[model samples]
Target: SMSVKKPKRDDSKDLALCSMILTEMETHEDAWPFLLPVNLKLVPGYKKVIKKPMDFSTIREKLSSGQYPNLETFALDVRLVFDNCETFNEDDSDIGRAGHNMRKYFEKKWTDTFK
Candidate 1:
């Protein structure tokens, strides 16, 4: 017979890593624009363009409640924020530049930390 550690270990580790990475992102210098959901009133037609809105606060709550099934799912939600930013803001605009900066920071951190 053979035995090995249960899969729960990976899940637990995923939770820890996800939490750490998310915290780092939240404190990042370029994280200001992504800290909260986009204001529809300020940016007219925002909802019409972005079907799925995401932000650090939403991701934080989802992670806190263990809503993500795995690290990949968590990563997808994180990426969604950047993706939406790219779609809604101009490349030369302040928020758009911040999104690009944050996305770069996140991918590097994700690779170094998880992969």
Candidate 2:
């Protein structure tokens, strides 16, 4: 069975990742490009897993509906999603690249959407 892991209060990485995702979503109309680079780095075989796809629409809908218990649970869900992703790895280089890609993606999307 798949399970989501909760982030500890002191876990900076988890908070950082969540912040990146939220910022990108808030700043960009279409976050795919920004998210893709991060996905490529953090998630192994990203293209392949995405080809098969999971149903995150419901999750997104629920999130938008304000059904989540709390930020901790939300963070856990994010971690779970990242963890269960076939492409995710614990590599530092991968993590760095993912973060960089997310930042660049947001920058590009912001420019394209707002300009």
TM-score for predicted model 2 compared with the true structure:
0.33
* lDDT of prediction 2: 0.46
lDDT of 2 by residue, 7-84 (tens): 545443543444455555545443332333234466567766554332234345546676665546654454344443
State every prediction's TM-score relative to the real structure: 0.88, 0.33
* Alpha-carbon lDDT of model 1: 0.91
Local accuracy by lDDT, each model: 0.91, 0.46
Model 1, which residues run further than 4 Å from truth? 1-9
The CA lDDT at 5 in model 1 is 56
Q: Report the lDDT tens digits of candidate 1 across residue range 37-85.
A: 8898888989889999999999999999979988999999999999999
lDDT of 2 at 41: 62
> lDDT winner among the candidates?
1
Question: How displaced is residue 114 in candidate 1, in Å?
Answer: 1.3
